[PDB]
């Protein structure tokens, strides 16, 4: 009979009285409006907000609290994501503003650093294959398809960017631990965020690591995104690292389109990834820095805020950029270079004169 | 989205903690089983049990608490009705037992009564036109169709059983009151049972009374059933009353089938009516009796139970038969005749010697 | 087979030849147009107009004659309701005009009355929970859900507006009668209007009364609407009564949205209720007045019409406002205050000089 | 399997190589376009054109060659009917032009004729009840419903226009023949045109004739349309005939809307009837005329064409108007009056001087 | 909305109060049961019974009154046809009994007649192509397909049974009349039975006559069935006529199956045709006889009944067999031969001694 009554959407509304951006930007009207929508692959709003709902989030710590199951999610649930995307990326408006992508290593300047605290340099991005559900919603078949596509493409790389693909299922635990310690691998997700998002399913099936012979170019397959590209260099020649990064990414993309596959990408958001915080470009060019001359400073938190830098624990700190949506890859790399140059120029403990220089 | 959850059937289960036969024979399993069924016309279980649920029923008073929206109901909701029908009709089992219908006025004997307390004699039955929803569920169009069919059929009656059809909408209030007082009309339903059953809808549209010239043969159209046939006689010659009743009913049925209409009827239940208490034949042959020599008796209620008689208030009492399902019309009339003959014979106040004679 | 023919809509058209606003504003074209529409929950036009069709209405008495089964009704059947709403609320046009709601007790002035005939003061409004069918169409599950939501919300009230919820099913008949006499309860619906609308179903299941300790703030749950809020004061300090009313209503609404529920509300109509006469705000601020110095007046009905006041029997009269749609709550309260001030000022029997003062 | 192929629409195209307006205005493109459309009641193009296809039509005789099964037909198959309607009604364009209806008997003048050849006067129109399929497609139930509606409405007529309804099924053959001879009945359809359209189905069930006591106002029920209204007068006082016609038609329409029924009517076409030739108003005001002074004239057909008159065989000729769509009823009646006045003024055989006077 | 109510089937029941086998074997229960069924091609019960309903049938004349729209009709509507088939074919029971078909011309004996009244001899049968709707329901495309199949098949005939196909649309009226007079053509259907059955649609499109050079073997395409085969001989050598008939029929069937087409045929009924009277074999072997020595006999109708013969008007009488279902073709031919031999043997007017000899 059609006279049976459904649960009112308000009955399913989460209890967000002690939470922290989905919780603040989710309202009864929005949930009721989106309670019945769904992407063509079956993704639904509750699945998007499950990770945030499960984890209330510690005070003073801002977490997005949602994920996307496929490309169509950002369109179907735009009314919810858009405020979150805007709040995350310091005012960027997905509805109106547009994103531009450039990967030219000629524009960059400076590049060379000073071997004082740079230690190492790295650049990282993510890429999702179109037509395949994202890790939060991907099934075993889709995950295996992503792995096959990426592996077959990378097999065609020639020259310096030529290496091998190692499957987690076929790798010894000791070797995996050694690679993790050497910063050349990813660990099994254990924090509540990933598992609540449902991205540790079927571990370690269909997760792998492709790295070049020199180990200066790595690609994680099915860890947080369909592909996570990394260009590393145990030094401070960010120019060369970014050059290798962009050229290898271009070659990988060319090989992807050769077989008929395309990276998810649209003008409003750019490259599409799971975490809305990683939308835009996904670039996280950064470096490692030392504790002594820097830890005992006066007000570096304000300095980092002024120069748009993100400081986190190594694994001595790690300094990178904050926002990926909006600015372009070359812009973000230049910003990081200028910020680290300022940091290593005004680090002087021999004298004083820190200027911040917003 | 198909992920939304319906209200569990147990959520809709009525609160029958202070009720009296649907309440005792309705259980969570039955409601859950039938919570989704429905007759082809859209009748549902909640509609069937609404009248009983609304009225808890006074203690010591047994009411069915149920109705049917059409014929298919008794099939669709048989798992629920059948215990109620069996409990009502003192053990009759609809599932196994079968019903037989006869209307021969030759079989009856005796007939003539004594003008002591008989006063008046009456016989009543009900009939439902197949293909049309019953009064609880009938719409305006179906009610008008029932009225048209019945009126056109009765127009063809000739001879003694020839009279006129009076429409309630075209009848003065004073005339209606006079007819009601003369026991030749039906009043607007006001008791909670009928209104809760939803049978007072659109009153007085499409309700009428067809009566012969002598007013000894009446038919109420759309009051409690599609048709309520009555044969009256201000006397005690039950033989003649039943003869006229059966012959007129046969003629009316013949005229009904002439135009292609059929009375609802199936072997298990016989003629189909709204109240499950009226199933079977609907016959309620009875008479009116006096107070003085009778009310002051010793244990008449036991006598009535023993002889299978129903005593109610006139409008001095009214005595008739109890059960309609099972026994046949001739059987019920003979039982009533024998019971009233016993009552009048063993009414002796001049002496004693009541024998009950179960 | 698809060759079977449906009943033409004109066949179902009611017989309104002796009725009084649905009958005047219902025409064959409108019924034919809306004969097949239905709200997503299954509400249909015939259900809306059943209450008016059953009750022809006494001459010179204006009754709306229709009800709404849910919010979408006012949209789906707008072509029928809109003329009715406009005729009821003295020219307000739902299609074009818009409604504004304010609940500020600072704007009100005067407030204090004279203890001559004021006796008592009261304010009343209604509120419907979104996502749940209205009482005319609500099922048992939806009614229980409404009761649970309201009770859980009111449990969070603290301070002066803190009290208890009493369930009808768990309340003695004598206590209920005493509360009714004290004007602190609602009686079981018995008028034909209520029952024909199907709002007495399942009585008294899921009907309750929540009142504060001082009994100056009451809330009827599932009597005529999902919630009926009342603020009472056995005096004439309308200012304080309205202050308590608005602050308590704001707190109740806040607690409602805390759990994810929202009151039905749209700009064109404001708060959505069953009777179209109660649309807009539902406010009926009024007072009780005495008979002697007032009943024997010259042309008080003209005075009430001029000052936009409604006078009805107590249970000495009750004087309040007429229209709720259009004017705002503060506006209506101020109008009532000014009207009663005029009445108690121009009540002079010591002398004459009534001015009406349209 | 869905791989099976339907017959191409061109396969069903009729063989119209020796036909006469459907054949000229039906083309392969139109048939292919409309080969799959259908009115909600199931009417299809082939049904519309069946009557024209079966009857090739004699040369020099123009017949419409199509009919409509219901109102929606004229909308659904407008691409085919519209050229036919325009060609029939001498240039009227249904798509752009609009129709206006008036029935005032005050506007008419003259009226009185000369008892030379007028003999008798008559006016005729047709009317279709909305919501019921037209005779070509109506089933038995719909035909009976039309008859019931018309009979119940006409029962309410009072005064001069009060009479009786006679059913064909209950009328003797001799009486029917006498009525036909007296021009007070219709004969069983036998022409191939009628039967090919399927309008003689179930004869004589549900066909009747309602006529007033004076027999000056007749109504044929279910002969060519749902209703055919006729006002007759064995004389030449066309003014009185038209007055009675219009007033009786107004009363009948009022009684129709009283019960909730409406005549089919839309601005573009006016009153909707089966034959597209009868669209617009259906008025055929005319008279009977004699042979001698008129037949042996010079160029009578030219005079009729110039004056917009239609001359046909009585059952001495019968002269009326040609077009119904476009001009209004009063306009058509005035045109007929002027034409007959001119005919009876220029009929002079005593002398010559015919002027035609286009 | 799904709350709208269909017309009850009893509303559509025909008015058969003055009819004659469908009318007697159609009852309200059967019509109600079959009111919604339909063959896969859309044939419905009302279409089947339309021909009988329209024509009441003269008293003392038995007509089947129904037709079939396709092969599946006899199965879908078996509950109605089966009593009619049984009543028509003197007790044959389609449900239980089975039909056997033989066409061997060796079994027949006698054959040669006496040139006294035989005059001419003829044999006729019908055949329907499987997968194509029967003439009552066939569209233009299906009719053209039947014509194409039959013509292409007959083109392959060689030897004595070689001739030409003449299309009605391409044949002069005078030639058609001459062929009709010579008993070598069929006339345009005009009887009410045919037109009511809807088998004169689109005349003369797709109707033809294929005849051999000697004109002793004819085939009517799309006149009453898809194919009507006839073998004629202006004499009395029934043996040769039947031999040619059976051999030509076998050759035609072989050519039909060559292209992948099959004659409709099932064991219960045999060859499937429109009129249920023609079911079984369709054989009507007969002869023409003279008036003088035969008309003036004593009890010829009794003789015809006893010998199972049918006498009808020529176009002097025509005598053939009565029943086709049951007995086989050879059986029917032998019965006709024996009956005519008896007739021409006991025709003696020179003396008496008629024996009837049931
Ligand atoms: N500049 C760097 N130099 C060396 N190792 C790095 C650098 N940046 C990141 N890593 C390594 O990457 C690993 C994971 O980094 P993570 O916090 O997941 O970055 P992301 O989230 O951008 O992938 C760590 O074990 C860390 O050692
Ligand atoms: N034997 C009788 N004599 C006279 N009137 C009777 C008799 N039986 C019933 N009636 C009349 O029938 C009316 C309604 O009876 P009711 O209780 O409705 O019987 P039922 O329910 O079987 O129709 C009463 O007003 C009563 O006067
Ligand atoms: N100003 C008032 N003072 C005291 N009691 C009141 C006042 N207004 C209403 N009531 C009480 O409310 C009860 C029901 O009122 P009702 O007519 O239903 O108003 P509404 O329809 O607006 O709820 C009555 O029993 C009456 O005593
Ligand atoms: N002016 C008239 N006077 C008398 N009888 C008339 C007149 N006009 C029509 N009739 C009668 O109407 C009958 C049918 O007319 P018909 O040709 O069907 O007109 P329509 O098609 O407009 O109904 C005829 O038998 C004829 O006698
Ligand atoms: N034995 C026969 N000899 C000559 N012509 C015949 C004979 N039988 C039938 N016909 C011709 O067949 C034509 C139509 O016959 P019909 O009554 O339609 O038979 P059926 O219905 O079996 O086809 C008639 O014109 C008739 O002349
Ligand atoms: C930013 C990110 O990678 N996130 C967002 C974070 C959250 N819900 O706030 O949790 C998860 C879980 C799994 C994968 C990615 C993230
Ligand atoms: C027996 C009868 O007519 N009933 C049953 C009774 C009940 N619910 O127990 O109430 C009603 C109401 C309406 C119509 C019939 C009955
Ligand atoms: C105005 C009101 O509260 N109404 C309207 C009234 C009518 N039909 O005119 O009937 C009912 C019935 C139940 C509840 C409310 C009302
Ligand atoms: C014009 C008219 O009344 N027609 C049209 C005519 C045709 N097909 O040309 O056929 C029929 C048949 C029945 C009723 C009316 C008409
Ligand atoms: C027997 C026969 O050929 N029939 C049956 C007859 C009837 N309805 O009784 O009518 C028709 C019409 C058309 C073709 C065949 C028959």
PDB file of C-alpha atoms and ligand atoms in Angstrom, chain C residues 120-122 124 180 183 185 220 223 228 232 284 286-288 312 314-315 318 324, ligand 3:
ATOM      1  CA  UNK C 120      -9.225  37.641  32.459  1.00  0.00           C
ATOM      2  CA  UNK C 121      -6.851  37.959  29.513  1.00  0.00           C
ATOM      3  CA  UNK C 122      -5.578  35.322  27.103  1.00  0.00           C
ATOM      4  CA  UNK C 124      -3.595  31.847  21.658  1.00  0.00           C
ATOM      5  CA  UNK C 180     -12.101  21.908  31.391  1.00  0.00           C
ATOM      6  CA  UNK C 183     -10.408  26.560  31.244  1.00  0.00           C
ATOM      7  CA  UNK C 185      -8.161  21.552  29.054  1.00  0.00           C
ATOM      8  CA  UNK C 220      -2.454  21.574  23.805  1.00  0.00           C
ATOM      9  CA  UNK C 223      -6.362  18.727  19.682  1.00  0.00           C
ATOM     10  CA  UNK C 228      -1.850  25.122  20.355  1.00  0.00           C
ATOM     11  CA  UNK C 232      -3.358  33.136  30.238  1.00  0.00           C
ATOM     12  CA  UNK C 284      -6.564  35.298  18.951  1.00  0.00           C
ATOM     13  CA  UNK C 286      -8.871  38.414  23.639  1.00  0.00           C
ATOM     14  CA  UNK C 287     -10.539  38.960  26.996  1.00  0.00           C
ATOM     15  CA  UNK C 288     -13.726  38.159  28.907  1.00  0.00           C
ATOM     16  CA  UNK C 312     -18.620  35.180  21.004  1.00  0.00           C
ATOM     17  CA  UNK C 314     -18.154  32.669  26.984  1.00  0.00           C
ATOM     18  CA  UNK C 315     -16.980  29.079  27.326  1.00  0.00           C
ATOM     19  CA  UNK C 318     -15.433  36.864  24.911  1.00  0.00           C
ATOM     20  CA  UNK C 324      -5.163  36.720  11.645  1.00  0.00           C
TER      21      UNK C 324
HETATM   22  N1  LIG F   3      -9.989  35.519  27.841  1.00  0.00           N
HETATM   23  C1  LIG F   3     -10.273  34.297  28.348  1.00  0.00           C
HETATM   24  N2  LIG F   3     -10.357  34.101  29.682  1.00  0.00           N
HETATM   25  C2  LIG F   3     -10.639  32.896  30.213  1.00  0.00           C
HETATM   26  N3  LIG F   3     -10.859  31.801  29.463  1.00  0.00           N
HETATM   27  C3  LIG F   3     -10.808  31.854  28.112  1.00  0.00           C
HETATM   28  C4  LIG F   3     -10.507  33.134  27.464  1.00  0.00           C
HETATM   29  N4  LIG F   3     -10.518  32.904  26.139  1.00  0.00           N
HETATM   30  C5  LIG F   3     -10.805  31.589  25.951  1.00  0.00           C
HETATM   31  N5  LIG F   3     -10.976  30.968  27.131  1.00  0.00           N
HETATM   32  C6  LIG F   3     -11.298  29.535  27.333  1.00  0.00           C
HETATM   33  O1  LIG F   3     -10.845  28.731  26.243  1.00  0.00           O
HETATM   34  C7  LIG F   3     -11.741  27.631  26.064  1.00  0.00           C
HETATM   35  C8  LIG F   3     -11.889  27.284  24.589  1.00  0.00           C
HETATM   36  O2  LIG F   3     -11.842  28.469  23.800  1.00  0.00           O
HETATM   37  P1  LIG F   3     -12.062  28.378  22.209  1.00  0.00           P
HETATM   38  O3  LIG F   3     -13.420  28.943  21.878  1.00  0.00           O
HETATM   39  O4  LIG F   3     -11.678  26.985  21.772  1.00  0.00           O
HETATM   40  O5  LIG F   3     -10.934  29.383  21.661  1.00  0.00           O
HETATM   41  P2  LIG F   3      -9.997  28.933  20.435  1.00  0.00           P
HETATM   42  O6  LIG F   3     -10.967  28.345  19.440  1.00  0.00           O
HETATM   43  O7  LIG F   3      -9.340  30.214  19.984  1.00  0.00           O
HETATM   44  O8  LIG F   3      -9.053  27.933  21.054  1.00  0.00           O
HETATM   45  C9  LIG F   3     -13.069  28.036  26.687  1.00  0.00           C
HETATM   46  O9  LIG F   3     -13.516  27.025  27.595  1.00  0.00           O
HETATM   47  C10 LIG F   3     -12.800  29.338  27.413  1.00  0.00           C
HETATM   48  O10 LIG F   3     -13.239  29.284  28.773  1.00  0.00           O
END
